[PDB]
Ligand binder design. Structure first.
Ligand SMILES: Nc1ncnc2c1ncn2[C@@H]1O[C@H](CSCC[C@H](N)C(=O)O)[C@@H](O)[C@H]1O
Ligand SMILES: Nc1ncnc2c1ncn2[C@@H]1O[C@H](CSCC[C@H](N)C(=O)O)[C@@H](O)[C@H]1O
Lengths: 373, 391
């Protein structure tokens, strides 16, 4: 069953947003098909590759339906998969977020019996959270494409975070972007939020020379020629909530829950106690052999090795004789919980020379995690 | 334009152990004076330590039972800010995206900026990002609402069944601390029942953190959610995807008003199997495929074309903040230190604008063949890749 499809992202910022696993793939893939937004990233991908690559953006044209371009983008990848190549597709940002050819190609490859998968990348939304500094999770956060919201007659909910993508291409199905229908989005915004509500125009920095765009505009300004002009195909709008929904006290109770200056009294207490805090109980610290660390890095970054490990974990462990007997045992189980037990130990036991028991390792809970809300 | 001022950068580790770390983040791990981190797996933790300058602190040491979360968060922020104030290049790292469900990060950045420090958050791979990749849906096809289970309930929000929905923290409805419980999970199930009915299906998602983890992506009918064998699967890392039950129709009048062709009758395709799936190779797709080999663009397209000096510099500026700061302080002088640059590249760089970069780093193959370089005017004047359509 030779031939495979992996689709990954390059993120938004030139080079810096690429993930370690993606860089590894770029180095290993037989052929790379890419659609990226800047020459430095393009060059970086080419230079790190085995030198067999194709620019998917060559399928666009001024007056050509983008849908046709997308079907062609998927198809060139699938042709090589069918020919037995290990194919990598790279799309800027996250390759599954506002990207048609990626999901299409993966579905078709899978249908035809080939292995296919998508890796996450840094999206424009991810960039926006970091740049504008709001936490979705507070209020919740709605993502929508500007044309899609209009053609389906949706209403925006003014109690939540709203993010509107492709604001610069309203009603455009080709590659000519004149903002000819942008006014229709403005109308939606006016009706849902009123004329005085403020939105943010967001463009995350693509190149080192770029400056983040995060300008605030009252909705009443959006029909101004000088404002309108600034909205390109790169533009995203952030629309903060106008009125958060009130807390329902009955829900609070049912959930069993209890019924601003930087350094208030509470914070000053926390800070004063910092230097002296002693935990209720001994916390485990990381404690792993070089062999264990080397292997875990290898498994994260080398898919061929991960495949070998999954096929026969006990034999694979036996190729790394630097592992402690406990690490070998844990790895042989091929489960996450045992890893946590061997790679983290109490300082008191580390001092005792005491390694976790077979029972402690095999008993580990598969879960974990820590919440920071 | 600085010499020894502290700075704060907060970055993510992403979700999957090691592999989700971004290049700019790894670069900072290597270069930072001090790293404060809160990550979920030991392999990631060891990787951060081993790549560092060896000055690091585990932020999770401030957690403890009987100790309120908020006190921990303040302490977490404070340890970072102290080192910033002492003139250190400080990195904080949090699981996933450091701005999604993370209080200490926003607090630290706000205070740092107020006190006049350079303070920046870098994006990381979120649980949501992992979900789109693993479950294979695009938020854009129907729109996508993301929210926390407790918050949805506490504000009496209704779920919209015409869109994609993502619900965080299903495994600990109404309980933080550490006594992670599913006693109030039935309240979320009631919400789902009201909004979607009993037969609608949800997906239970856990993205793999360790190489040993397997992706959880099981489909359950809402009627199944109270079954003991089903409840038992939900943990603190669990997220639900609720696919649209009743997507809104394309309004032919709205299509008209938008100036789109009357052929636009369906939305963009979702491939998960939760919606009806058109044939992959219908007439429209077959036409595009048949046209592929002989496609010739109306105008000649530029290709990437830049000196080694230009590529070397652009990579350095992406990955080396100190160098970027130097470049910004005096772009012309900086460009003059890289004599491998073409005259055009030096001129473009001196302008310190993105538009000039695109001009010098891309060229028509015809112009390349005839050795024509862009003019000073073409460079000086700084006046699309969309990958989805509704049609
Ligand atoms: N630099 C940038 N800043 C802000 N939004 C951006 C952006 N680049 C792309 N976008 C958004 O993304 C849309 C293109 S669709 C492709 C999105 C990409 N796959 C991702 O994960 O982000 C744009 O119309 C805009 O809404
Ligand atoms: N491995 C995993 N797979 C799926 N969902 C996960 C996950 N880890 C965390 N989550 C989800 O994320 C919620 C908040 S914790 C993770 C926050 C992190 N900063 C991020 O960028 O995503 C959890 O309640 C859970 O719903």
């Amino acid at each position: 069953k030779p031939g495979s499809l992996t689709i990954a992202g390059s993120g938004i910022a030139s080079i810096g947003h690429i993930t370690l696993e993606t860089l590894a793939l770029i180095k290993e893939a037989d052929k790379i098909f890419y659609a990226v937004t800047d020459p430095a990233t393009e060059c970086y991908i080419q230079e790190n590759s085995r030198g067999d690559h194709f620019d998917l953006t060559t399928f666009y044209d001024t007056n050509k339906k983008r849908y046709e371009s997308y079907v062609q983008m998927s198809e060139v990848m699938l042709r090589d998969v069918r020919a037995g190549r290990n194919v990598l597709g790279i799309f800027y940002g996250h390759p599954g977020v506002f990207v048609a050819p990626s999901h299409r190609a993966i579905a078709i490859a899978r249908e035809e019996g080939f292995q296919a998968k998508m890796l996450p990348g840094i999206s424009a939304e991810d960039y926006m959270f970091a740049d504008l500094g709001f936490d979705p999770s507070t209020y919740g956060c709605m993502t929508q494409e500007a044309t899609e919201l209009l053609v389906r007659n949706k209403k925006l909910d003014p109690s939540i975070h709203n993010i509107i993508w492709q604001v610069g291409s309203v009603g455009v199905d080709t590659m000519v972007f004149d903002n000819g229908k942008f006014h229709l989005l403005v109308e939606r915004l006016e009706k849902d939020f009123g004329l005085d509500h403020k939105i943010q125009h967001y463009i995350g920095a693509i190149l080192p020379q770029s400056v983040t765009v995060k300008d605030t505009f009252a909705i009443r300004d959006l029909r101004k020629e000088e404002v309108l002009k600034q909205f390109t195909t790169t533009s995203t709008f952030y629309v903060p909530p106008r009125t958060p929904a009130p807390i329902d006290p009955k829900a609070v109770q049912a959930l069993g829950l209890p019924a601003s200056p930087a350094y208030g009294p509470d914070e000053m207490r926390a800070v004063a106690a910092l230097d002296s805090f002693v935990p209720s109980q001994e916390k485990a610290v990381v404690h792993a052999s070089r062999a264990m660390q080397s292997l875990m890095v290898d498994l994260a970054l080398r898919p061929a090795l991960l495949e070998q490990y999954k096929a026969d974990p006990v034999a694979f462990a036996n190729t790394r004789n630097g592992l402690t007997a406990q690490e070998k045992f844990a790895l042989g189980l091929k489960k996450p919980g045992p890893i946590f037990v061997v790679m983290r130990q109490l300082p008191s036991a580390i001092a005792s020379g005491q390694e976790p028991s077979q029972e402690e390792i095999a008993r580990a809970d598969d879960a974990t995690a820590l919440v920071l809300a």
